[model samples]
Target chain A: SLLPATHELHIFGSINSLEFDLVGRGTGNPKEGYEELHLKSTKSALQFSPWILVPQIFYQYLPFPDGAMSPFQAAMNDGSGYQVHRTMQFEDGATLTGIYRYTYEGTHIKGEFQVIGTGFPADGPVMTNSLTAADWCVTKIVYPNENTIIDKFDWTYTTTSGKRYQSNVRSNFTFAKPIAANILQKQPMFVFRKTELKHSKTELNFKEWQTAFSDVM
Target chain B: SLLPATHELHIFGSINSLEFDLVGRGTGNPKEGYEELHLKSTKSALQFSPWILVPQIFYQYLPFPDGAMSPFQAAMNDGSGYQVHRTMQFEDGATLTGIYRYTYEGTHIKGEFQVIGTGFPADGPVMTNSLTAADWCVTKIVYPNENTIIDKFDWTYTTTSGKRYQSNVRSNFTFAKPIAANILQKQPMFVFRKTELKHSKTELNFKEWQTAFSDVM
Candidate 1:
């Protein structure tokens, strides 16, 4: 089945790191706005953690790979799929495209993704400088039971100016088990979300540069 | 109506500050268990912001004031209510008590709250050290429309020791308008929650002590 027999790709947690070394040189100081904006962006992302990033990654896993049968569909059902491009849009008018490829084995599937996008000049003072590029690869996918699967993927991000950020994630995807009459009943969704937020953790590296302007960011 | 004619208290935003001056001196350093734990607690609180604190504050404003006709009940319906004490329990066996009082005028309600609680030593390496004491006062409550209210409140927290934390919150409580039917309809709860989060902000003061052993906290 092209649908993978599962529901959502649940991000359990991630090990995250960011490097804004080039940010100051690439842009101006906080008073000029870039530095403070980046700092705010970084803190906001940390505050929200996996949630802020989940939607962007999860939507790409859908069947609408292109305008046609996505490589995801072809790979899950036909054994292999390659270079399927898909563009995801955000309300801010920003757009991102993911280039994906995959190969399926009897027990699992392997995939790789490259994401690139442009920003929108937001209404506020801070221009929405969105993701310029990112790379992600699925390391493994295992089906524990007919209704459950787990996968590990590592992802990295880099701005147009070469500043970088990275993370490694292990995710679980579970399909509702069939209930009384051989029908899959809808499971309570909030339970999964609650568990996700409870387990999520992040380790932030205080890059040397963060303190250089330590007077205040 | 004892209900105040409005629904839930929507915490819009807050200006928060925390001073853990005595945490290190009162308890041993990180390795011995106190310092690192407090640091983690502080960071976790900062990361979650008003959310980690909201539930504790929100639940106390409910209709269940005491065993019988309570102060909140008396105040909203009549003119004044006094020192109505209530204890709130947590899942982990920890409990806290709030001593509340209120006075209602034609245009507004004036209220004050004092909270004190204990810790729960669970099956984990770290114990759940909940709020030990807190003081809160409602400055003003204005009814713009029949079913809408805006209130400003200031709150302060203190450990069993001398350390302190404080914040001021402006909240909005709005009851949904009646639909085509004569009964008021339920507003989408998530919309209010989203706005609460969107406008939330916090300012962290790095007390001189935070850097004392900062080679690594």
Candidate 2:
């Protein structure tokens, strides 16, 4: 039997940002620090149920210089600093997740997301900040699945700058796909795979498995 | 009822180089490109059940020509570039598990894992990848819940050039505090707020939880 083909989906969106300076000296541009969220879901079929393995990935790319360009421009422009977090979940209640954060400093960038929570012998909660938290939610469930649907919502709040900003956002996807890999492998479902950043700086690639399952009996 | 206080856990270990480049790159270096396996398990009253999240978070420094540094350097370097893949799982009744892959680029990553089986959407027996066609056995089971435990694995692969290499590493941590916000508030298990990277610089910072979830319930 053949496997299912992989699907590559890309969505573009932005988040409202509150500016803050990292270095005591304010040399960096009035960076807007915009956020971009990405979501991709893949399904495989089970004998008994249409169980799907939905792995949610989240990313936050802040524009270079605080106010180099508008939200849209920052996103389009290259050279922006960003952070990425990824998590995997099965409809059957299993998951694995991790986070990676990086930032620029002068000629080079620096930063790491370490283990947070209880120290030593005891296991503790992995701590994450608000910005990371916001991006995580936006990307993980932004896309729709076979059994899961996401709805977008937005709200407004004042930043330390005292300026009121209207934030647009939502939860879950609009449509739902099948939860089974077998069903997904045959029909039109999203198949997800990985490609290194070095492989194709502009585009991501994956192993295709389209219609390979059609002949199965 | 008082919630559990945050605790800190120490994850210290070294990874050996595997035969293949887990990252797809041939060159393997202990500093930038290597693979290490991580494993963890937990069962407690606070948790829904004994669960584990195995993820690979790659590490690297800035100003370097290559995209990222090796896992060893990530653990002990000035800069940080920790990227991780989704995860795989053993079948319900089979000793063998399905392999799921996810990639972590600079600020973007994606992938998923599914159970092996044969059914409608595709054509094959229900137990193609199982160790035994009749009596399936699961080698491992990773649980998922609000407060989950995490374990990581790592493997490194090297190439002749020494310039290009790859690493497969995993880290697991359990959430000390379990608080449920609206579905909207739900976020990825990993990430930090406010750090940014410029053209080609790197930055490292400590990880922390936001004030929103810091206060005891």
Candidate 3:
């Protein structure tokens, strides 16, 4: 055998901004960790995005509303029936909960998300913590891999508030005012990951390598 | 039709004790960050192993003689030409440099390393700074998926010292001395990374998600 009788496993993937959106809204003062994104007047949500870390790279969606970088940020994986939940608690005793699901392999890369708010100040001219006037509502599908957008978005502004918005946008809905100004109308799709290898001594015959690895944790 | 008309990309991989060792001869008092390993006298080097980071599910190999955790850890990828280098310098003027290269598609993982030593007390009665005796000179195949082992080892013990050793092992080699006794031979391949998700009624059809992660870093 030449040089690579040693089995070497090469595994890698990276964060590319996957999804883009202009959403509708509900109202909340929002808290730490969550950026509280929305597209005015819309309510429920569906989203995904990529980010970079100093030493490593991973992007999180269904942002576990708790901390910007903690157990949640580092918590994600590949599998069928994978799901995560995040909760945001306001100083006003109101809570917004986000539940997320992911499926890969077989029925791959599908996400189903449900967000709700509860325990609110229903009647108030000023945003009274009600899912009604919430800052973020429905969302738009912009600059996305068209074949893999979130198919269904069923969410409530918050629990107990009972107010809800259900939508099925077969295509990106035409944007309203502020949302269009703040959005990128179109973008490129992820083509493919390409690789190549070469050595200085062109006569170097490399060995056959088989690679496989699993976690012992 | 629902919104997800966008094509989604699904990719993943892992690092299997990426820190394999095969440097030639060098001498040092040997303090932190190195094991000083040897199979009694087979200074002939070739080895591999994994480790646990607090809450993470990966084990980086070769720690490559330097940096607490840098490129070696975050420097692996799927493209054809990813590379990283690490080094360790000691008070005795010995140095270990770990250079790494990786690829997933056309060109994959291969490594070439160099280590050397100098400033020895030649007047000493014992050969304290001889490459003839050094630890971390060899490695083992720990995972069940064996058959692939380090095919070659040609390295110096440190910088400045020209003495070196070179050889190959077909598979996992049994240790001759008590190196096993001083090691945590029975540690799970991974550590940390605990997660628990909740459901409203708990009817969640959850699979026993055996989780694993590799870098596209």
Residue pairs whose backbone atoms clash in candidate 1 = none
Q: What is every candidate's C-alpha DockQ against the true complex, given to 2 decimals? A: 0.01, 0.06, 0.01
Best by TM-score: 1
| Per-residue lDDT of candidate 2, residues B1-217 (tens digit) | 1111121222212111101111111111232222222212121111110011112112221111233321213222322222222333222221212233333333222223322221111111211111111110001101134333232222111112221111222233233343122211322122111111111011111221111111110
- lDDT per residue as tens, model 1, A1-217: 5433222111121111121110111121211111111111222243223222332322113332122322224334554332232333334323333333444444243434333332222231113233344442333443433343334444444444565444443333323331122111222111011001111234221111111110211
Interface RMSD of 2: 20.2
Please give, for residues A1-217, the per-residue lDDT of candidate 2 as tens digits: 1111111132211111111111111111123222121222122111110011111211122221222232212222333433334333312232323233444433332333321111111111111111111111111121123443222212122223332222232233211223333332222111111211111112221221111111100
Off by over 4 Å in 2: A1-138, A141-147, A150-170, A174-217, B1-32, B37-53, B56-75, B78-217
lDDT of each: 0.28, 0.21, 0.22
Candidate 1: Cα lDDT at A86: 33
Indicate the residue-level lDDT of B148 in model 1. 35
* lDDT of prediction 2: 0.21
lDDT of 3 by residue, A1-217 (tens): 0010111111122112222222222111111211111121122221211110100101122221222221112222212122344444443454444454433323113334444445433342113322221112122122222122221111112223442211111222111112221122221111111111111111111111111111212
The residue-by-residue lDDT of candidate 3 on B34-98, one tens digit each, is: 21111111222222111100011111222212222212222322121233333333323433333
Candidate 1: C-alpha lDDT:
0.28
Best by lDDT: 1
Candidate 1's residue-wise lDDT over B1-217, tens digit each?
A: 4333212111211111121111111111111111111111222233223322332222112222122222223335554332232332334322333333344454243334333332222321112233344443323443333333333444444444465544443333322331112111222111011001111223221111111110111
